[model samples]
Target: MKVKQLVDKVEELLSKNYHLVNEVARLVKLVGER
Candidate 1:
């Protein structure tokens, strides 16, 4: 299990689809407020 590889792949995908990244950030922020 290569955690670094997985993270890199996810980051790359997020970079390609910035809207998803923003949605994720919004969801994370909402969760953090609780």
Candidate 2:
């Protein structure tokens, strides 16, 4: 659920910057893993 919130925020930012999506996903995955 927390990841979903992160994803939502990232998704919002995606409208502004698409290129960093992969990097953001990688980071969220790492944080979620922890």
Candidate 3:
């Protein structure tokens, strides 16, 4: 996986939807492990 692109995307997403951070964080954790 391209960690850099992923990092950028995550940063953008987190910043754009800061309100959903908790929910997104949980989902991301699950999806990331898969």
Candidate 4:
């Protein structure tokens, strides 16, 4: 049960970070164009 709880937390963090990375990449591309 403890291990499952930890895994769930990690998955949540990874999902959140994934979106953040995508947003950062998009912003970088926009800045590069300028």
Which model is ahead, 3 or 4, in terms of lDDT?
Answer: 4
Name the runs in model 1 displaced over 4 angstroms. Answer: 19-34
**Cα miss at 33, model 3 (Å)?**
44
TM-score of each: 0.47, 0.40, 0.45, 0.78
lDDT of 2 by residue, 1-34 (tens): 8999999998889876865787798899999999
The residue-by-residue lDDT of candidate 3 on 1-34, one tens digit each, is 6999999999998887876777788999999898
Q: Per-residue CA lDDT of candidate 1, range 1-34, in tens?
A: 7999999999998887898878989999999997
Q: What is the C-alpha lDDT of each candidate?
A: 0.91, 0.86, 0.87, 0.99
Against the true structure, whose TM-score is highest?
Answer: 4
Which residue pairs does candidate 3 place in steric collision? none
What ranges in model 4 sit over 4 Å off?
Answer: none
Top model by lDDT, which number? 4
Sorted on TM-score, best first, the list reads 4, 1, 3, 2
Candidate 4 residue lDDT tens string, 1-34: 9999999999999999999999999999999998
- Candidate 1, position 25, lDDT: 94
